[PDB]
Amino acid sequence: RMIRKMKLPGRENKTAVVVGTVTDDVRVQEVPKLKVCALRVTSRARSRILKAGGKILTFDQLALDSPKGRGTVLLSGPRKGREVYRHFGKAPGTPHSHTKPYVRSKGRKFERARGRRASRGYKN
């Protein structure tokens, strides 16, 4: 995400700012030069960025470098990426609601017969 949003046009050699954690992503091959500021960076992410030739900053250094935070691109992680969010909203077993139910285990015998089929009674 950070590389994509920093290679979006216009925002060249600006400082990416994360008030969270920068984790490593193994399904990406080439790492550009980066100027990151973050609360904490995982060890492999640090190794990748520094080997690619980037610079990692803490927020005190960011404050010293730019008190008004100008020249910065403020990012965040996907807030609804947690597995908890697929259980929310319109209740399962209600027409047009793709909500994940709470099942003890997934399989053939667990919550698949009567509110799910059309042969076994009805389908929601």
């Binding site: 193994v26 399962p92 077993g93 009567r114």
Partner: protein, 147 residues
Amino acid sequence: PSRLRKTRKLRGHVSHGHGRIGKHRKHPGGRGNAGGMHHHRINFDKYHPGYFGKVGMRHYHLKRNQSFCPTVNLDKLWTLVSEQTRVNAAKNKTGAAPIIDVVRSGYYKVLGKGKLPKQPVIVKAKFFSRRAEEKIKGVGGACVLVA
């Protein structure tokens, strides 16, 4: 810690937070999850569709060791070997292709999800999917099957 919980704040309040009209009785709805068909019907329908009834076949003596087959994706394919291998393969102009044996890593089937870097490979797996095979062909490389 009992210091921090709710029973300490309820000292002096008569009903202990359970109301006075409807007291805290013992089992005012039946033990466990009884009445799923009768008086908890709409709870069961509204949050547990498909709970009642049967569907499908039976398998009397099922063996997960027989049914065991982990999968890996073309995104993670290059992670299974050291990056020294990838760097040297890209650097080398002879045309030699590194061998990626996924059974050694512990995977049996290769599924092709994402991009694959422009580099020849010999992928040595047990099963393949059609799209994974076409992507490996497109990058230029071989899929060799093992038993």
